[PDB]
Write a protein that holds these residues in place. Structure first.
Motif, PDB file in Angstrom:
ATOM      1  N   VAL A 124       0.788  -1.353   0.171  1.00  0.00           N
ATOM      2  CA  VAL A 124      -0.033  -0.690   0.240  1.00  0.00           C
ATOM      3  C   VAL A 124       0.626   0.936   0.243  1.00  0.00           C
ATOM      4  CG1 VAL A 124      -1.298   1.240   0.699  1.00  0.00           C
ATOM      5  CG2 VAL A 124      -1.791  -1.431   1.464  1.00  0.00           C
ATOM      6  N   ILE A 125       0.354   2.373  -1.208  1.00  0.00           N
ATOM      7  CA  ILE A 125       1.311   3.365  -1.389  1.00  0.00           C
ATOM      8  C   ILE A 125      -0.100   4.440  -0.614  1.00  0.00           C
ATOM      9  CG2 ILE A 125       2.692   4.968  -2.933  1.00  0.00           C
ATOM     10  CD1 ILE A 125       2.957   2.633  -4.504  1.00  0.00           C
ATOM     11  N   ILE A 126       1.308   5.333   0.594  1.00  0.00           N
ATOM     12  CA  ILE A 126       0.411   6.618   0.457  1.00  0.00           C
ATOM     13  C   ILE A 126       1.029   8.056  -0.378  1.00  0.00           C
ATOM     14  CG2 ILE A 126      -0.286   8.059   2.021  1.00  0.00           C
ATOM     15  CD1 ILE A 126      -0.115   6.048   4.442  1.00  0.00           C
ATOM     16  N   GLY A 127       0.317   8.582  -1.121  1.00  0.00           N
ATOM     17  CA  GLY A 127       1.023   9.404  -2.096  1.00  0.00           C
ATOM     18  C   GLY A 127       0.764   9.402  -3.732  1.00  0.00           C
ATOM     19  N   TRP A 146      -7.644  -0.907   4.139  1.00  0.00           N
ATOM     20  CA  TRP A 146      -6.124  -1.065   3.457  1.00  0.00           C
ATOM     21  C   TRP A 146      -4.779  -1.096   4.316  1.00  0.00           C
ATOM     22  CZ3 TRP A 146      -6.627   1.252  -2.445  1.00  0.00           C
ATOM     23  CH2 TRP A 146      -8.188   0.908  -3.485  1.00  0.00           C
ATOM     24  N   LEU A 147      -4.810  -0.122   4.980  1.00  0.00           N
ATOM     25  CA  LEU A 147      -3.474   0.350   5.696  1.00  0.00           C
ATOM     26  C   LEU A 147      -3.726  -0.876   6.685  1.00  0.00           C
ATOM     27  CD1 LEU A 147      -3.569   3.550   6.377  1.00  0.00           C
ATOM     28  CD2 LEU A 147      -2.061   2.873   4.454  1.00  0.00           C
ATOM     29  N   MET A 148      -4.341  -1.945   7.083  1.00  0.00           N
ATOM     30  CA  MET A 148      -4.726  -2.342   8.046  1.00  0.00           C
ATOM     31  C   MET A 148      -4.025  -3.713   7.740  1.00  0.00           C
ATOM     32  SD  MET A 148      -4.161  -1.227  10.634  1.00  0.00           S
ATOM     33  CE  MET A 148      -3.854  -1.679  12.059  1.00  0.00           C
ATOM     34  N   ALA A 149      -4.510  -4.498   5.699  1.00  0.00           N
ATOM     35  CA  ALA A 149      -4.532  -5.456   5.633  1.00  0.00           C
ATOM     36  C   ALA A 149      -3.299  -4.847   5.031  1.00  0.00           C
ATOM     37  CB  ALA A 149      -5.249  -5.356   4.493  1.00  0.00           C
TER      38      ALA A 149
END
Ligand SMILES: [Cl-]
Ligand SMILES: [Cl-]
Ligand SMILES: [Cl-]
Ligand SMILES: [Mg+2]
Ligand SMILES: [Mg+2]
Ligand code: NA
Length: 442
Positions: free
Chosen positions: A14-17, A66-69
């Motif tokens: 998972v990419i943030i940004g 999504w982050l927690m997966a």
């Protein structure tokens, strides 16, 4: 463990940004047969345009499930690890890295790593030019417009990276051949609520497992956390391994007690740019680049625009574009050690962001200083010394007041100590407009 063979296949990444940095992360995983998920708090990030169809995306907020997966969260440096969604993922043991961490795991050439409050881009670019003068296929990046991951290539023989405190916070695998913290000045208070030493602590990560630490002899916050050690080489104005020597109008770069170059052979001017040149030379020497070609690069490097840039020298007046100075610490670096034979005509102003301008006062006494203050917060700048100050709304208006007053020997310096956004698209537009007006008026 994977070792040097980090493998992301089969992982939920998972990419943030969705700025250029996050997009470079998408490209990195796609190249390795992983389709990541991406999210961005902005409803319509520009980078959405550039995503492949297969990449699932979520915009307008972070997506907690999504982050927690995730098996791996790749956080762009614009989101704080302190954001509650990321802190929740960390408390669950989910691995959080950034682009520079992914880069360091894959880089197959030495890395020169540069951080600090002021001067990063000049030093990074200059070490790059020193390497190019040696014929080295050097990869130069890390600034927002050239994300490090785009540089990865087995043909690269050296990497030179500009690193932010935010990138360093998520980086654990950096082993720089040479690393520097150029300086630490109060900046990014929002992201560091425990103050200057917290901001510093992020930058100090750059020295972990570095072979050589290039430290600023004039700034103790650039020393490694446990103090100077056998890895440390210093640069400074008056003393240090690399320093400046001034005698009777002449200035030389000096290394280990030996003059190495008269600065009249250089294209840069200004004390801060000379100390940037010293830091760059120290990093290049430490990286193993030949001294002779590194000196040649000091004579050809033009400097970056808006960094104490001489945009006009005419009729004995130097017009200097230091529009990169968007904060008090940067303008302090421009004023310290400033040599002006006549009168300094100093342009200050813009959006001061509620800063304390007190540190500038000690530079503004003496009979040869005039202030021309403009922008949103011009009145706060004129208050530093009202008797020598004019105040206008715009930079052009201020420049038209000072232009009929300059004489040979004078300097006109745009080092505004403020952001440009009250009146300009960005600091580059501010500097370009200063350059245009200097040519019209000078
Ligand atoms: Cl810079
Ligand atoms: Cl090398
Ligand atoms: Cl700005
Ligand atoms: Mg590629
Ligand atoms: Mg205000
Ligand atoms: Na690898």
């Amino acid at each position: 463990g994977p070792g040097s063979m980090a493998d992301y296949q089969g992982k939920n990444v998972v990419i943030i940004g969705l700025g250029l940095t996050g997009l470079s992360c998408v490209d990195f995983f796609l190249a390795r047969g992983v389709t990541p998920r991406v999210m961005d708090t902005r409803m319509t990030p520009p980078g959405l345009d550039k995503l492949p169809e297969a990449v699932e995306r979520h915009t307008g907020s972070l997506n907690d499930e999504w982050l927690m997966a995730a098996d791996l969260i790749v956080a762009s440096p614009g989101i704080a690890l302190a954001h509650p969604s990321l802190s929740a993922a960390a408390d669950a043991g989910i691995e959080i890295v950034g682009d520079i961490e992914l880069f360091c795991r894959e880089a197959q050439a030495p890395i020169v790593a540069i951080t600090g409050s002021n001067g990063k881009s000049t030093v990074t670019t200059l070490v790059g030019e020193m390497a190019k003068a040696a014929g080295v296929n050097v990869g130069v990046g890390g600034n927002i417009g050239l994300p490090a991951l785009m540089l990865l290539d087995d043909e690269c023989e050296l990497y030179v990276l500009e690193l932010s405190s935010f990138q360093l916070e998520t980086t654990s695998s950096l082993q720089a051949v040479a690393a520097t913290i150029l300086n630490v000045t109060e900046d990014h208070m929002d992201r560091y609520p425990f103050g200057l030493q917290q901001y510093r602590a992020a930058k100090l990560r750059i020295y972990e497992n570095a072979k050589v630490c290039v430290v600023n002899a004039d700034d103790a916050l650039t020393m490694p956390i446990r103090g100077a050690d056998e890895r440390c080489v210093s640069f400074g104005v008056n003393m240090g391994d690399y320093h400046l020597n001034h005698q009777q109008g002449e200035t030389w770069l000096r290394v280990k007690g030996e003059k190495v170059l008269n600065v009249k052979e250089m294209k840069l001017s200004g004390q801060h740019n000379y100390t940037n040149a010293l830091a760059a030379l120290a990093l290049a020497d430490a990286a193993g680049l030949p001294r002779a070609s590194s000196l040649k690069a000091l004579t050809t490097f033009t400097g970056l625009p808006h960094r104490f840039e001489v945009v006009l020298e005419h009729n004995g007046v130097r017009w200097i574009n230091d529009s990169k100075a968007t904060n008090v610490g940067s303008t302090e670096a421009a004023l310290n050690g400033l040599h002006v034979d006549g009168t300094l005509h100093l342009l200050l102003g813009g959006d001061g962001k509620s800063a304390d301008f007190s540190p500038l006062a000690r530079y503004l006494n003496g009979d040869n200083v005039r202030l021309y203050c403009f922008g949103r917060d011009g009145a706060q700048l004129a208050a530093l010394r009202p008797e020598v100050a004019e105040q206008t709304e715009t930079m052009e208006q201020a420049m038209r007041l000072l232009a009929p007053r300059v004489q040979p020997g004078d300097m006109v310096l745009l080092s505004p100590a403020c952001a440009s956004l009250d009146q300009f698209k960005n600091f580059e537009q501010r500097g370009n407009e200063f350059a245009r007006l200097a040519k019209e008026l000078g």
